[PDB]
Amino acid sequence: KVVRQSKFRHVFGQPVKNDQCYEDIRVSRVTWDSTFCAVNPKFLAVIVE
Amino acid sequence: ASGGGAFLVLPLSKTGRIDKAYPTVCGHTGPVLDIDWCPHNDEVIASGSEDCTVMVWQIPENGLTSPLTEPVVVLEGHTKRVGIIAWHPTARNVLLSAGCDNVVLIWNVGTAEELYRLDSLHPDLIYNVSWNHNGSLFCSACKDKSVRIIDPRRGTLVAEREKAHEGARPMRAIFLADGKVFTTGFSRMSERQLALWDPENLEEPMALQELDSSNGALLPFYDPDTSVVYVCGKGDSSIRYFEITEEPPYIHFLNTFTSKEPQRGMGSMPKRGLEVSKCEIARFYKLHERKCEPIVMTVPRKSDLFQDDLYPDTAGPEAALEAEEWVSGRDADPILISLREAYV
Amino acid sequence: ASGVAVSDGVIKVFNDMKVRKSSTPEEVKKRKKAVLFCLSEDKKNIILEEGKEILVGDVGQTVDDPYATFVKMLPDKDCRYALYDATYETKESKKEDLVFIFWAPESAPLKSKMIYASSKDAIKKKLTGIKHELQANCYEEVKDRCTLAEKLGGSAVISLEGKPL
Amino acid sequence: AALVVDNGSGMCKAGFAGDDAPRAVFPSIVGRPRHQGVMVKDSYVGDEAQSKRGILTLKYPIEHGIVTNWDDMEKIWHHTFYNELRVAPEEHPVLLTEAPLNPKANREKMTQIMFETFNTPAMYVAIQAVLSLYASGRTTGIVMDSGDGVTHTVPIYEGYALPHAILRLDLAGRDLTDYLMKILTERGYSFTTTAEREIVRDIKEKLCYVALDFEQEMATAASSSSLEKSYELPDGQVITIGNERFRCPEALFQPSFLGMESAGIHETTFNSIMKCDVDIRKDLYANTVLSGGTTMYPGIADRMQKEITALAPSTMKIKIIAPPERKYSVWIGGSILASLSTFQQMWISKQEYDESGPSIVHRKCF
Amino acid sequence: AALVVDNGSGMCKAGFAGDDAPRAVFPSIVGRPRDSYVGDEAQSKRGILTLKYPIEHGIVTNWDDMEKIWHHTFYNELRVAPEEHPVLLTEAPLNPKANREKMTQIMFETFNTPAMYVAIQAVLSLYASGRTTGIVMDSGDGVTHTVPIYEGYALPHAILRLDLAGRDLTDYLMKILTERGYSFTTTAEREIVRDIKEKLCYVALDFEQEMATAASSSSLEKSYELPDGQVITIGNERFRCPEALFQPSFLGMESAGIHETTFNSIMKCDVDIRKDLYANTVLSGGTTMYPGIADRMQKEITALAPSTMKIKIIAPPERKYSVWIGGSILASLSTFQQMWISKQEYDESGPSIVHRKCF
Amino acid sequence: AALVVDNGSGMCKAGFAGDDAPRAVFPSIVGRPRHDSYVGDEAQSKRGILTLKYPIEHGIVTNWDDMEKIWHHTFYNELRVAPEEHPVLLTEAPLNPKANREKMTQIMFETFNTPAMYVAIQAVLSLYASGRTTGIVMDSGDGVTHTVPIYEGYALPHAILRLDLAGRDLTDYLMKILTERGYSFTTTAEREIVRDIKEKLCYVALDFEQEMATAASSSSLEKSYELPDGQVITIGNERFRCPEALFQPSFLGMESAGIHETTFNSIMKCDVDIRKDLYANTVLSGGTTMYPGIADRMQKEITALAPSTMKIKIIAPPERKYSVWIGGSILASLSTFQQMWISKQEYDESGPSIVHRKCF
Numbered sequence A: 001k002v003v004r005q006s007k008f009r010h011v012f013g014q015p016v017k018n019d020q021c022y023e024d025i026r027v028s029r030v031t032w033d034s035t036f037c038a039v040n041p042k043f044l045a046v047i048v049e
Numbered sequence B: 001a002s003g004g005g006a007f008l009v010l011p012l013s014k015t016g017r018i019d020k021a022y023p024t025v026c027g028h029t030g031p032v033l034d035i036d037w038c039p040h041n042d043e044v045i046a047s048g049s050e051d052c053t054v055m056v057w058q059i060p061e062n063g064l065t066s067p068l069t070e071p072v073v074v075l076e077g078h079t080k081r082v083g084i085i086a087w088h089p090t091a092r093n094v095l096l097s098a099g100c101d102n103v104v105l106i107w108n109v110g111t112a113e114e115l116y117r118l119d120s121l122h123p124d125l126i127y128n129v130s131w132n133h134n135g136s137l138f139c140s141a142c143k144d145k146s147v148r149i150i151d152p153r154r155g156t157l158v159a160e161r162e163k164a165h166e167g168a169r170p171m172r173a174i175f176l177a178d179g180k181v182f183t184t185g186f187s188r189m190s191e192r193q194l195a196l197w198d199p200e201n202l203e204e205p206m207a208l209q210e211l212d213s214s215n216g217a218l219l220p221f222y223d224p225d226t227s228v229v230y231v232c233g234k235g236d237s238s239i240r241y242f243e244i245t246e247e248p249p250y251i252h253f254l255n256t257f258t259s260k261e262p263q264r265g266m267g268s269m270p271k272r273g274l275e276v277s278k279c280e281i282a283r284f285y286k287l288h289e290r291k292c293e294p295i296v297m298t299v300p301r302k303s304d305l306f307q308d309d310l311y312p313d314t315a316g317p318e319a320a321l322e323a324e325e326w327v328s329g330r331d332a333d334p335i336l337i338s339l340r341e342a343y344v
Numbered sequence C: 001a002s003g004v005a006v007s008d009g010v011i012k013v014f015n016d017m018k019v020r021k022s023s024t025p026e027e028v029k030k031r032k033k034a035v036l037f038c039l040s041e042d043k044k045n046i047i048l049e050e051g052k053e054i055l056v057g058d059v060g061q062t063v064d065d066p067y068a069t070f071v072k073m074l075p076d077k078d079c080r081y082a083l084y085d086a087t088y089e090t091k092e093s094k095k096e097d098l099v100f101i102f103w104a105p106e107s108a109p110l111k112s113k114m115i116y117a118s119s120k121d122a123i124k125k126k127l128t129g130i131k132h133e134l135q136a137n138c139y140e141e142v143k144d145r146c147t148l149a150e151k152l153g154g155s156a157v158i159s160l161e162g163k164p165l
Numbered sequence D: 001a002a003l004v005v006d007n008g009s010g011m012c013k014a015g016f017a018g019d020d021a022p023r024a025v026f027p028s029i030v031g032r033p034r035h036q037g038v039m040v041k042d043s044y045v046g047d048e049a050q051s052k053r054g055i056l057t058l059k060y061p062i063e064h065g066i067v068t069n070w071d072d073m074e075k076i077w078h079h080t081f082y083n084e085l086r087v088a089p090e091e092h093p094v095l096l097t098e099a100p101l102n103p104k105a106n107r108e109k110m111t112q113i114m115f116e117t118f119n120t121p122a123m124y125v126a127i128q129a130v131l132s133l134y135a136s137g138r139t140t141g142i143v144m145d146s147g148d149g150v151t152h153t154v155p156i157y158e159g160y161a162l163p164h165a166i167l168r169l170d171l172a173g174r175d176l177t178d179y180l181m182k183i184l185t186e187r188g189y190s191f192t193t194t195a196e197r198e199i200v201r202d203i204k205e206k207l208c209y210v211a212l213d214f215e216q217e218m219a220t221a222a223s224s225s226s227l228e229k230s231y232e233l234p235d236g237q238v239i240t241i242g243n244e245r246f247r248c249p250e251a252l253f254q255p256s257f258l259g260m261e262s263a264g265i266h267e268t269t270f271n272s273i274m275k276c277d278v279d280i281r282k283d284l285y286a287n288t289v290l291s292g293g294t295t296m297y298p299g300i301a302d303r304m305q306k307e308i309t310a311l312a313p314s315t316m317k318i319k320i321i322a323p324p325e326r327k328y329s330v331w332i333g334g335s336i337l338a339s340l341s342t343f344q345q346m347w348i349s350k351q352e353y354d355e356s357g358p359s360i361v362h363r364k365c366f
Numbered sequence E: 001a002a003l004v005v006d007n008g009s010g011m012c013k014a015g016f017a018g019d020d021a022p023r024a025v026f027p028s029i030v031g032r033p034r035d036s037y038v039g040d041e042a043q044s045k046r047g048i049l050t051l052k053y054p055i056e057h058g059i060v061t062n063w064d065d066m067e068k069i070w071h072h073t074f075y076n077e078l079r080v081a082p083e084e085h086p087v088l089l090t091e092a093p094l095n096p097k098a099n100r101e102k103m104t105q106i107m108f109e110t111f112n113t114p115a116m117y118v119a120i121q122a123v124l125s126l127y128a129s130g131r132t133t134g135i136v137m138d139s140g141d142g143v144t145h146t147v148p149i150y151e152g153y154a155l156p157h158a159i160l161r162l163d164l165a166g167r168d169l170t171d172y173l174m175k176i177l178t179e180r181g182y183s184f185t186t187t188a189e190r191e192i193v194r195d196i197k198e199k200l201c202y203v204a205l206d207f208e209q210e211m212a213t214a215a216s217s218s219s220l221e222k223s224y225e226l227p228d229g230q231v232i233t234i235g236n237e238r239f240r241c242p243e244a245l246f247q248p249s250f251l252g253m254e255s256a257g258i259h260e261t262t263f264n265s266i267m268k269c270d271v272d273i274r275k276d277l278y279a280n281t282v283l284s285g286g287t288t289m290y291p292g293i294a295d296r297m298q299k300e301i302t303a304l305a306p307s308t309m310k311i312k313i314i315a316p317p318e319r320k321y322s323v324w325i326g327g328s329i330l331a332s333l334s335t336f337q338q339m340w341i342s343k344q345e346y347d348e349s350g351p352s353i354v355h356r357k358c359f
Numbered sequence F: 001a002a003l004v005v006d007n008g009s010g011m012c013k014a015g016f017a018g019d020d021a022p023r024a025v026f027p028s029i030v031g032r033p034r035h036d037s038y039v040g041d042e043a044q045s046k047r048g049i050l051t052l053k054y055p056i057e058h059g060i061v062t063n064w065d066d067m068e069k070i071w072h073h074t075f076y077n078e079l080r081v082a083p084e085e086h087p088v089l090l091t092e093a094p095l096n097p098k099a100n101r102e103k104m105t106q107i108m109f110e111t112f113n114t115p116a117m118y119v120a121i122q123a124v125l126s127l128y129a130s131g132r133t134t135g136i137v138m139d140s141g142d143g144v145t146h147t148v149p150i151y152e153g154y155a156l157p158h159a160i161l162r163l164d165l166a167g168r169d170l171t172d173y174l175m176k177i178l179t180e181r182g183y184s185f186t187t188t189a190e191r192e193i194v195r196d197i198k199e200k201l202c203y204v205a206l207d208f209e210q211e212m213a214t215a216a217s218s219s220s221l222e223k224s225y226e227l228p229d230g231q232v233i234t235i236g237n238e239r240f241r242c243p244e245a246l247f248q249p250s251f252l253g254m255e256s257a258g259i260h261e262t263t264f265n266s267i268m269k270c271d272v273d274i275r276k277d278l279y280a281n282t283v284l285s286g287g288t289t290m291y292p293g294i295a296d297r298m299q300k301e302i303t304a305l306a307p308s309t310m311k312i313k314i315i316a317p318p319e320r321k322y323s324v325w326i327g328g329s330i331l332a333s334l335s336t337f338q339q340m341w342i343s344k345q346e347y348d349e350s351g352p353s354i355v356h357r358k359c360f
Ligand SMILES: Nc1ncnc2c1ncn2[C@@H]1O[C@H](COP(=O)(O)OP(=O)(O)O)[C@@H](O)[C@H]1O
Pocket: D007, D008, D009, D010, D011, D012, D146, D147, D148, D149, D173, D174, D177, D201, D204, D205, D206, D291, D292, D293, D294, D295, D296, D297, D327
């Protein structure tokens, strides 16, 4: 009653280690406000210059 | 322990200050909640912890020289923490485990098998579980203020007494040698009480005596040889012991041992390990925050000879039945041994 | 604070013992390995105990291990002040340090024990540079090489006088 | 209705969120009898132990800000909920306070007891230095609290705390109370028992003060009797104290009186500021906030202003903010925070703690 | 020829520098009728007057009576003129600087002593033991002090005070001797009990075990002859009276035993110096002359201290007067004559001169 | 017979030219009673009643009077030699202010009357001990951490980076986190106990988050240490949390980057044509680089920063704690070094103008 009932009130973010990131990607400089990234369980697609 | 959980196992001879680097039984990934020695094996101890597992260990005869992290059997059947562990009094290699998931499981450590699963009997948190005299039944204390007598092999509810204690504080229940159920609990006014129950007539208790208005659960220690129940409260500095007889009011207050320091745990030595020649009927290991202090309970006697009346035949370190025999449905009493041979 | 002063002979011996000057080998053998200090007859100044010294030259020819013979030099029932040049090796360095030793046996008379104790903090202040102090109140607290080694470097010491412990 | 509980080393303040003063203020002591009963309760907590202290042995469950024995600590909380506040802990959420740089092990026990022993529906832990800033209505300032066990200096800038600049001083009211005994035996009055600890502590709270010039105050007290005061003991005896009135609080500014190597409270506050960034030291000088009961001595603010000014550069303006209710600043700040509409998102549920554990209380707090 | 006076809590020790033992040992009391009696003269009249202790707890509280003791010391006990001999005085630990100057003012203006010096009793006892670093537990008549010393300087923040000494044990022995049927209540009977305590009492290594031995036989029973010829026998009271030192609960005292007080004072010192203090515990005072006091102390402190440290209790056989004996040899040194507080120096700097020269 | 004296923030190593190890290593501590002064190990043994002060803080002199006591302790109390009879080789921090060097020269020639004296950069000497003329030296001592790139014997001052994070900061951080376990160390005497703990039980984890997981779910990583007064204390994750401040300065509230990024940034400031050889000759120096596993963590971190085609090789000789001293001994024994000596008779007629030249 005091606290709203939920399962996600304590979800926290945590960036992945450096060795599992993707470096040296010329990310696009297009002013259009899109996601610039599409990912599926198989591949990672990033818009580049 | 700094990480995971561990418990310290040391020989009784190793008194005095204990090294801070003394090897410990550290195999659990979470804090260990309950431990219990095997009544038929003096070097086997089971432990339940927060990692939802039960681990059975084998202790070397001289103790630990290096930290012990590998157990004999890793016994995994619970979804939540396991805080209740009770070996079978007469059936060899038979162990009871009850977790916070409100399920009672009877296992076979010798074969790592789950003999029985009892999940649909306790609707709330289980406080403690105690076997009866011959291991046929067990009583359980539940958060809903109910006391239940359950047959594990048949998975049936023999009897039940709702609202055994009206208080919302934790309450306990143990089995006596005669077959009665001794329970400690709290009243509606938060007053600590003791109760005696007859499984055949659960309408009203024979005895209902109040002690005080302090906090903390009461841990009862029953001695079948002398029919004396020692009541130890968590955080209390006193130990009260009562005598259970067939005459009214069936609960007789004997005396109280008083100290100046609260106790954090409590341990009772089984009858096979007491100093038989000094009329010592109970030895209690009082657990402080940084010390374990043995307490010796003795009967004042002028004669220095052996006391037959104080010291009847007690259960020995040998088992009557085995795991497969008890599962079939056989029942037998524990084999009684003689304490006269221990006289020096 | 008994007011007992330190004689200039003791001071001069201390500077010679402490600071090693570039000298020819014959003068090196004349350096003091151990030396004892005792009160004067009038008990007004700390004087050198004549003849009770160990030189570096005697080490290896007449003296096998300077520490044991230095202990034998300590009287059984009298207090003394001692200066020992300890050569020892650590796990990572070789050191040559001076040790000031207070020898106050229980068998010594009460008057002797008091005066040396009451003037220890005055003579030690004059002898600047000593970084090990060994207060031995019995023969068992000084005769052991390990006891000296424990004060020198605790458990890091691995050798003393070129001999393993 | 939320509960605000401030458990200090010597005193425990409790009340309800939205009030202006703590409803229950009792000493944090547990007493046990030391004699035998001859005429036909094994422990006493709070004021009931203070009234019967003649036959009891008083023990403080908290010493130097660390909990010596948790079994008596639960008795303090049990007395608070049922005997002082007379409320059911399983109905009201509890807002709890912790010392700065509190060990995570100490915090884990504190929340576990609340959720499992008292079954509180919701719980939250806040840094005592933060609430003391809420009571003064500020977002920037260095809070120097001085309670019974320890002294903390916590600089906070624009709502951002600087953990690396937090300093500790193992010197508080209990150490001063012990020091007052050592100098009281000089005048011929002997106080040794734990029962007499509360008598000396009461003397300190009524007759002690901080002298602006310590050396001058010795000169005045050594040549005049205008600085002498009289106090009546519980048995009717009257004692008189002279220079001991201001010598006891002087241990705060000169810890060498206790054989301590650490610096005084004025230098600890100054050293805390110098550990901060240069661009924020100007605001911390003008927003020095005092907290705790040990900062209630008469003239302590004036002495603090003089000492810090001698250490700080001449161009900086030193402001010692000493509200008259600073003895309850932590609790008052706690009540204010528990009443804000933006705080309901900080409550930690009992259900959430059951399924997640203490991992969620280490987060959502500082 | 200097004078050494040890102003103890209950007994005053006085003598001449260079002597092995004090010349006069008399109680430090003042007798006033229920016109002024001092020392044994006050105790010879017994119960007609009331007795007061001006230094009841090591710290002088009534200076008018203290001057009477010193006047009685110089003229009646030492039998010398104070104006012809320098006087060396002993002071209790944690003695306030105010009493140090009052001691200086009285010595020079009332007795006109040519020279004076003030020394701490605990420091002399350690020096007499041949040490500069250690902890001295001085158990006297009215107070027991545990004074840790490092390089001849007391650590004031670590000195603990115990109001449990020979005076309390004598009263306790008086209380427990009534359980055998004997009656000792008067002042004269109190001196008899003290004589019994100093001759037959001993400290038992194991208190509970010794009770079993005393309750199962009579090998521990001793006979004592009263001054009028009656003979009394005492049994388990021999070790029960000194046991109150280690178990103050026997006297109704909440404070800890003298073994724990020594341990507590060590724990108040710095961590680096505790190892030296554990191996340099020195006993002093009359109350530490009970046979079996050193071994019991070694056993008790070992159970408290960590097992890796060496506990060594030093009990010199002359520890009863180690404070005076150490002080006497100080004043007998020719090199110590420059440490006397000369009257010329007192006339210039006043009573404050004692702080910068006697520390 | 020449003397080599390497004055550090915490330890002052002294010895004789031509030797292989320092004959005299003692803490650079001046202690005074708090109940007339003690220097070095004599202060370390009596630290129970002394107030210990470091004359050097962050490689900066705070009190020159205490500094002369340190030097007086070296010549007369530890080395047991006359300073006026032996040439003495001094060591200086990189980018050492000319004012600081002048005071070192003035004290040696006027107070100690040394016949000859020379000042050398600590980073240069560290490379001699490893037998190299090209590589970046990351000397992390007690007060400050420096990254000095060197190529073919040529120093590049513009690429020298300084990190105000070293052994003293780690020791102070260990005390802060030890209170989280229940052990309180506040006095300057207890600082040495914590420093002794850090040198014996601390190590650098290859991964930090994983090392937290095993320490929070197992008791294999706990160790026990015995205090001087006998109580035994145990430490768990504090063993590798304290050295982690080297790679994550944010633990101390510091904004600057870790010692791995500082090394990479110092290389990035160098010319492109020499970066390949600096990647393969990364030399560690100082006592703060003696943590077990610090070489492996350095290699992993720099490899993640450097391009994939460059071979990262962290050179961590087992005697790197005395690399500066050992390098000084070799220089003082070389035949080509005698023309670097600065005579006393040359200084009193010329002044510090000749020591600013002939040095770097
Ligand atoms: N008016 C006063 N003057 C001086 N000291 C006081 C006064 N009131 C309280 N104190 C001291 O402050 C100490 C702690 O009070 P408090 O601030 O409540 O501490 P905590 O935060 O630990 O509860 C007490 O030990 C008491 O001696």
